[model samples]
Target: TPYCVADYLLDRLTDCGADHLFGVPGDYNLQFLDHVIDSPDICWVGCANELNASYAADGYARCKGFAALLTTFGVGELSAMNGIAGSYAEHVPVLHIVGAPGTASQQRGELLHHTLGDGEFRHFYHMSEPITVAQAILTEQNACYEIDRVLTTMLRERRPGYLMLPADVAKKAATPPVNALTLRHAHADSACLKAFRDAAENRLAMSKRTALLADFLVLRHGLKHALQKWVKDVPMAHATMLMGKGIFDERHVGFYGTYSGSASAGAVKEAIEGADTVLCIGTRFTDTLTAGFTHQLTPSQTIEVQPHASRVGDVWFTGIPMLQAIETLVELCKQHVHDTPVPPDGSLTQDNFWKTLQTFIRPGDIILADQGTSAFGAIDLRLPADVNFIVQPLWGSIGYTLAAAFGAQTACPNRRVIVLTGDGAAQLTIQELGSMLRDKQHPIILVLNNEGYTVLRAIHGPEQRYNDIALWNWTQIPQALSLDPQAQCWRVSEAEQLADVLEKVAHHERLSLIEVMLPKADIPPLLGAITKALEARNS
Candidate 1:
């Protein structure tokens, strides 16, 4: 039996657990789009543009573990490049399939419309090399093997991959795949594992205070359950960096607030840094998350568990999976549990915004916040059990969560998706609201209207004209974006009005938008401190 390359690709995507493919249709990709339309298991999701499609794919990958994106060659693929780079920086597994000109056209060096007026077709592929884990220019002979290899590598590394599928090659008949793709897993050597365990045990035995610090890689590698169980069984102080906000249940007795070095609030800094022994899991100490590398964990007092390896203080153990390392720590921790400190109450400043949001969240809800004030304020939120918090602090791409919310809602239709984005950030990708309204997806979107770029103002110039933007009627945007609008829109300035709108949206089912009006100068407390430190460093 024989099948077209498109058919085999769709089948492989479905097998990899991607139920939907996101992209914009173009002439070269239309033929492949037909195959996507005909597929039974995988559905086609059309976005407003290629960039929005890529952003949506990133969000879908975050929810579904892996996702596929399609676009035509040149213009379409280049437009999606920034989004793909963001995905790469943040560790999202997205398969980017670019439909190129026919193989004959490429071989003949014919000038194409989307090309740079030149016959060259390899420029975009070269540009994509840095952002994607693997790249393949597909043909009938190599389609099956290349698809399997690229997808497998993407899943393994938890990053984006690229495939350039020529128009002619996509329709060519190919032999069916006989066996499923195999994924590789790493195991720790028996000697190294025992040594790591002994070192960690010794550290904990001697230490009077211990803490656990986790980050986004925990979620990417699917070790949240192990981390959660370890934290629950052991009562030591625990916290996550901003990127991994909801990895461990924030309601756990040992849970400390989000840890931002030097920017940490109250007892958060002392609890994690004061510990004699710190177990760091799948975390990278990025500049923003660490307040410009302000974290004070000493190499001699820390045990770090990465995706493929573990480190006991200064001793390194290769080939140990994160899950196995965490399991060993859980056993060691059971013997030495300690009491954790609690955070203090706060007033109704920008600092108190997250406290209000904490009461609004529930179990199983998916919360997405964009980079800027929304993300900074969300650091202190206490997520309920099973709740998923998604943020892109490392990439720090503004306007990301708006489209990401759409993709996440599409991935998990049954679960509620709450989106938090600032007005300045929303302007970049607000068109996705039309896509959401067109698809009839119901998500609670809160637009934090601070009049301008509050985060930028906090960082450098407080009164710079560059930080200002033209304001729009925030509540009226939904109706303007949708032809047949079925959404509830409201503008709230007072705390009481915001609370009332939140209550109404909790029960109301259709798509809802709440415009939260905050002072332009009022930035999150953590962001303020971070910006001050950033300025000091620059000076």
Candidate 2:
């Protein structure tokens, strides 16, 4: 019966379709770790620390959807705060399972082994509540029910949550098998739907230059599919993440750019500012989205479609569920297909854009995408089909690019991966340069050096130091890692040198590091003002 609890825990994870688990094991939960390792459904990834494990779990979830992290209680759980907080802010679904102290021992309150500042229940309960959806303490008798309950809550809430499993719980008897369910919100009320449709119709009638700003969550929530099909036959095009342009076949005529505020596509500047009907789906018009609406969304007619009620500009629609609204729109478009205008040509050539993008990457390349604008650049720039794009979405840690790229090369031998990281964020994980050399993976590292954390600089004011970072000899990274003899390093002050080094790397197999130093004063005009305002608000 004792072993049944361990089996039931594993079974619940399998029921939830959890394929991967990331964590660093410690003495506090070695027994639980042993049980986790034995499960065939779960794959445990080792990390250097609890924090990094949490971050990697976050990244895996960002790319793969629904990630899990298992760590010992106390230090392991606390160290994972940064990643949990990141997931909370970003709205990623993560299952954080902390292997807690044995229940019998916990009740003794004798300051059991591996206890941190919080002691027992106060320790596990208090630390994880702020970042999790529902925190559970698993005992042997009903551990599986707790697992299922928390997981269902997480999926429905679309937020990260935690489960605490005591070592003793793993020995409990199994409960009856539970079926995993994909919960969806009930359909919108007839009255609410009519009101929303009427409001949307009115807004559409008023605006001449209407555009839609969509987000990945829209896709995740099942709205994107209907919207894509419906909008395809209409004049509308989907505007999502900078990298998400691939969604609409960005080659299409009516397609605007990714509307990620400062990191947004160049083509979106006029479209957003001049739009009449801006249908925003599953995207928060946060400082990063509208740049604090500094681009003057006031001039635009807005309709926001989401699972929750959120306001945008003067036009407001409430209680239209994300999936339901999308379905409604798709049906509306099918019925009124003849009434919609033909797609517009806004003077931007998709062919030329793709051609320019082609020059930015080559085949057999490993790419790292850091958070912020540089990450936007990585996503927007189309690469050769053979190229591998590194996604680290979980924690959205700023400086994870270079190091993760290095780590990727180590795991995948003979692959040449490059990192497209911001100057400010690169400083956080730049130490990975040394890891690359020590591991004998000489992947080319490219630094998009825009004076500092250009993403922050763009969002914040163009002030000197608040967002500024100390400039480095970008070329020195390879040498600093002591890989000069094993790899090539280049510093480019201009676009020509950048092109040259990129070409050089194409011809070589050794590791290459190239730093492209752009003028600090030069910021993309499209998002500059909006970003400045958002930065001020956050500050």
Candidate 3:
């Protein structure tokens, strides 16, 4: 293979499990795009816009273990801020490569087309500092070194990394990687682990009634199965927060439902908070996820397991590493539950939609539920074994899942990729549907036709004019976008009709869009509590 700066970066990405590079093309990135197209193992997946590209990369990373994004200069990079910020807010390993003006132009402070006309080349990079775990600007001498450094950091940290690849720098020749890229785990200190184990063992010995609570970090950092195995042996009453809904197999008999702070289902609250000792693995309780941070768990009764540390009671043990921390917990002792939801009936309500949808989901399916009702409601469903429930509850960005579904589909083409979004969310990023249709990817898109921002309506204003939305004939959206002769579309306002449509969609191998009809004001039990808590907090 011809070695170049772009090739080294692309190879490093592929080495880290990315098969596709998602982004839009611009003159600044066109030179680098040529190299991307030439890469033997990596495929180029273009998006409708830079924002969607960033989001697509996020979803791809979530599924494939890692993903890379490409964009051109200030205008394009700026467009991807929300998605990249969301990536930071929630942990996703996204390698973002921004194509800049030629090195000569940047060095001369020339006013480039995509620049702000102020000749400030470092503006966007500075803006990106906090959102990414690592930042590097590639040069002929530093390309390979910095590439290795950033990818290593990203692989360990499981967050976004920013790389500014000038057009000239990308074309500069570099030697190929002789050794395979090392996937290293974060460092663990033996003393710290030993101390943590002693403390955890001392604390847990008396805990007859124990609980295991895991969240998104465990899933993002590749420790889900390890956690699952330990829980299987222990069989303690266990649950997940909204953010990490799919980490455990919900089909497990002892699995309790999603745990909100104080708003959790009565049985879940008693199982977790009422326990003598609670083990929190990779759990970050966001405000919404915790229902205004109302969890009654005190430090004395909690054992906090983080990515690079552990906490037993109020004592902190740093650098223990999540897996080692888990191993220590397993060594100290062990662990670890699902409830079947009802099927829906005549008129399709939000309750019916969730109930019917739960039964429709099969094993190994990846479901991307958009923010608000779809996400909050999805947590209420008991996901089957190997089912991936993707939501941005922490970031809570609307319309994120629609594009993410496309990326998830691209990442796992063999598995069923389903999109659950509301009419308002679908309206925000409807263009991605064209990309999905153009690529001929068969992801079931179920748009909940709730007519407006239903979550906001529940929060503060039930009948405010601002919460209303212009209605679209959702069933016709696919045919309006592309004449994909095989694409199937339907609108089901009745529960029985929805059941029929779901069965039909499951059997159809091609693209399917099912518009689900629901009352505009109806909110799931979880959302109702979360929204009420949010409103009261504001008051």
Candidate 4:
């Protein structure tokens, strides 16, 4: 019912594929919660806190292509800063709706609880400006217009958007939207298209072997299937950056594997770099993924397709969308075609853990590996065809995958969800574990108990006190968090001990946690190279 401001926005959010609303309940948003409760199309998913909710929304968006996050004013929104910023940097489209004090208080600039008490409310809004793609302060009269406008931009850009909804305005009467949301892509300059096609054609003709390098943006812009189909039709060698794992089917013969800078495995760097001309689609080389700027993909040897533009040999096409740019390549690719591992266990060393996981992971499972050792460890594995891998290397946020697993599980209840987070990272967002149990989400969480900040220690502080984190009793955590009889936990020091536990949980119905004990100094081989590169750059 678009009878009130809250109703209208909720309707739009559901239309954008948000089945669940992830957030914490606060006084300002209490009324909005009522509206959420009343809505039949959308369910409310309460999180431990604002930050966890934000990460959950991000994870949901990662799975469903879009998600909604609601938080109350200043403290709530600020608490979620890290998560929202991660969304912006990583290109996840999460709609952030903030429940503010009444409109009168805002217009009068009155001091309020949750406000900074400089009689200012815009502080948070201004702070959020840099992180969000589009933002608006919603009024009862402007609700319909701004909701459509901001959500459309967020959808089109595949990034986060911010909306400030005053408590008074939320209940204020509003008209139903007259028209459906008007979605659009950036204009593809016809002339720009012609130049790109000609250049690509010439480049294709001039090249002996061409390779396609796809990254996270390809999935963000909802073009994963298109690119996958394109590669299937035209058999050119292809590789996904670690940031964009699962963007391409690794089972294909032409697949070269995940590409890092010098850390890439099994001749992946050579496979990608050896090509005469490389087609880079929606790729960005972050420091972590590229290992301290060691990437050597030259502009002169590349045809780059960005979301809003295209570039060939440093010649930029400003108005061309990625779809249009890739379509041009698709046509050119009809002419140019090309084509293109893991495991372990021990006293539970990092090496064996991944090998065990590689074998344990079933097809169609959703894997959420945290940015620390978990991500670095799992980054190079060749996943089964339908598995979805979620790791935030670009954003580099610790503990993101814990809450993310909860959201991804909510997104796809039937499929198995795997959580790969280390001890230190898991501590940051462990409250979400109860949230998952309360909702009865059966995710297999492998908490990598390396005793401290293993990833950071690998890079800078090997023995520094700053890298040391407090230890916790892992097996007792499930019991402490929930009273559910279906919950299970195991602290594994021996690699062989995992055989029975893993097999038992294979068909069992319940949430599971495995505290995987590993050596403090042991890092993945790929991550070892990355850490040294990072340390070198650090100095």
Candidate 5:
């Protein structure tokens, strides 16, 4: 008697604490879907396409620490590559399982369509190389170990990895091993510690107006409250790159809103220009964070703390082990109790910032963020605390916000969920607009219609194709997808009209689409500058 490899894989996934698998099954991987269906613990979440599945999977992981997905060899796998790359870039952990040709067939060099066209196992090799920490072709003897090893490695490293299952092996029965793997912490050694301490000392000794980037690592590494106390005297701000719900309570006098190019307030920009030292903790310092790289902390005064050393050179800074850097700062700041003077009336531009943001917020609003500038912008705007910020923290996907808003409304029947998405990325999941109308979910979507993929444009540089998208009649999407014949569409060209429509939409029961147009010429000043720096660094 033999069992399908899909069953074994599903069992392994269940053991690894995965309750739901977000993906679509292809012809080559239909058998695997059957296994997912049979297991109550592991459910298949069918998506519109392989790319959406990847986005959904990334979203799930962002909400949850880790997520798994199953897809066919090339089409399914290639479609998922974008999200996997995104997860990798952002340091999110996700498990990818792609069905492949059987081992026997692969070894025999059979001319199989799913087989690599270039050479032996070319697809599997290339796929694994690009997005995997480790790729294992689950063999019978080490099937359990291989699966566990790959999963453990990905989680430990905080990145995406692949498990390529042979079609024949997927159908073969194997005993699932129950092994408890002990986790290890690889912290900085004595030499690494001294190097970081020296760097921190140099930064603290030089700069006057210092700030700290209190990101997820502050909490992830158990240094939030402590880091807060350490830098309480110095002006502090955190990037809402992942933690959209405001990790540091904005109610604090010393705390400034999340800093990024598009979403940044003039106050934050002024703070950056005035600050002498910046302690960036667990933040990648993306163009959005540094205000388009317009302002860079001279290397001598900037210290970045990262869990891993991947984004070391991404910004101009002295890199240190995350925990070590925070502990050192906490101890060093104790020596001098310097307080940041409060800016005079109209100095930091808080009033103007609030005024600008008030033009957007309305009652009964549900805001969803795409985990980058848009998410950071949403947090920076200081929307009411009651405004539900539906954000996926673990995996930061650009297009999931539109689709997730549909799910959010499905979960909460009464409230309105509005997606504040970047102009560039709104196009990727614009298809989800149809989903909203089909479900009759009246979610107000504000596309920061900057004409291109602003997040990628901010990171990778301004290119027509790389950051550009075809101009869409965002108002027409609701009509196209709206099942109700009486649905109305409005195109607002200015802030006043947008505010008026925002007020009117509250009472409208039928599905309505309002496309609030913004100046296409304007770029988030800070982020635009950072993009230029990134382009320069790469070039």
Candidate 6:
């Protein structure tokens, strides 16, 4: 039996659990798009442009296990590169499929329109080399093999992969796989798991106080439920870094709010750093998340669990996956339960925004916060059980959440997706709102109407025009962006208005956009501290 390369690729993508292909249509990919459109298991999601498409694919990948993105040769591929790079940096599993010119045209050194005019067809592919986990230039002989290989590598590494499909090659006949694709997993050696268990047991047994610090890799490596169960069973004072805010259940008895080194609330910092033993699970101490690496844990006091490795103090254990390592810790700390102190009350500034949102959040809801004040303010939010929080602090792309919300909504259309983005950040990809309205997606969007780049203003340019932006009538944007209004828009300033709007939108079925008015100078406490530290270091 023979199948076209496009059909085989679509089959592989669907088998790998991708239900939708997000991209823009182009001349190079027109034929391939037809195959994508015809695929019964997968539907095509057309975005305004390639960059937004890439972002949407990234968001979808976060909700779904994996996602695939499609784009045409030079122009489209380059436009999507930034978002693809973000996926790579943040460990998102996205297969970026680029439709290239015909193989004969490339061999004949033809100056294709999308080419660099130097007859170099591999330039964009070469540019993508550093960002993606693997790259493949498809051919009739290697199409099926390379597709499986690249997807396998992407799933194993949890990063982006690239595939360049030539126009003719896409339509060429190919044999489908005889057997199902085998996904690769790093298995723990019995000896290493036992040794890791012994080391963790020794640490937990000797320590009077133990704390668990989890980060983004918990979600990236698909250990959220395992970690949550472990935390629930072993009641140690637990906290997540800002990037991994919702990976653990914030309503858990042992939860101590978000831990961000010195920027953390006093109780949270003391609970995490002052513990005799700190188990750091899938945590990366990035500069912004760690408040300039202010965490005071020594190697002797820290047990680190990574995706495929574990380190107790300075001793290392390879082939020990994070889930296995976490299970070991759960068994070790089962009997030891610790009491977590409550955080102090705060005023209605950016510091207390999370406290209010805590009441607004519901279980099983998906919430996204952009990488500015919105994200920083959300650090302390006590998410309910089964809540998934999305943030781009690792990439720190300002306008990401706007489109990501749309993609996440598309992925889980039944569940509610709430978006929290600043006014400055929302301006970059506001056009995607039209796409959401067109598709009739009902994501509750909260735009922080702070006038300008408040995060930057907190860092160095408090009074600089560079930090300022064109003031937009935020509530009026959704209506202007869409022709047939299927959304309810509200502009609220005071706490009462915000509460009232939230109550009203809680029951509305259509899309809702709330423009939340905030002071230009008001920034999250964590952001304020981090920016001051950054400024001091630069000066």
TM-score of each: 0.95, 0.76, 0.97, 0.96, 0.72, 0.95
Candidates sorted by lDDT, descending order?
Answer: 3, 4, 1, 6, 2, 5
For model 6, name the residue pairs that clash.
none
Query: Which pairs clash (backbone N, Cα, C closer than 3 Å) in model 4?
Result: 235-338, 236-338, 236-339, 237-338, 237-339, 254-340, 343-355, 344-352, 344-355, 345-352
Point out the higher-scoring one by TM-score: 5 or 6: 6
Model 5 worst lDDT window (10 residues): 344-353
Q: Which of 1 and 5 is ahead in TM-score?
A: 1
Cα TM-score of candidate 6: 0.95
RMSD in order of candidates: 2.4, 6.2, 2.7, 2.2, 6.7, 2.4
Candidate number that wins on lDDT, 4 or 5: 4
Off by over 4 Å in 5: 1-18, 115-119, 174-210, 215-246, 257-277, 309-380, 383-417, 422-424, 434-443, 448-497, 500-513, 519-539
Residue range 1-539, candidate 5, lDDT tens digits:
25545666677676655677766676667766777888877866666666666665655554445678777887778877876776676565678888777778778887767555653775555755766787787776667668778877876666788888777777777664555344455566677666656656655666556665656544434445565566454544433443534445454555555565444567765555346666666765544445444454555455666675312223423334556656766776665326564641221122332244456665555667775455644554555434445554345666867766654554455876666676666677776566556556666666665566656654655565756677887767765654553456677655556656667776547556665455434444434444566655566
Q: Per-residue CA lDDT of candidate 3, range 1-539, in tens?
A: 45789898998988999999999988999989998999889999999998888888999999988998999898889999899999988989998999999889998989779888888899999999999999999888798989999988988888999999999999888888788798866657667677888889888887877788999999998888887887776677789998898998887866778899878999899988988889999999889789888888999989999888889999999878888988878767642112121215899888888899988999898989998788888888988889888899888889799988888989998999889998999887888888888888899889988888998888767799999999898878778888763588898889999899889888549889998888888888888787667766787
**Alpha-carbon runs more than 4 Å astray in model 6:** 335-353
Cα error, residue 408 of model 2, in Å, equals 9.8
Clashes of each: 0, 8, 8, 10, 14, 0
Clashing pairs in 2: 2-171, 58-394, 59-394, 243-379, 366-417, 366-418, 424-453, 442-511
Q: Which candidate would rank higher by lDDT, 2 or 3?
A: 3
Clashing pairs in 1: none
Give the C-alpha miss distance for residue 88 in model 1, angstroms: 0.9
Residue 462 local lDDT, model 4: 91
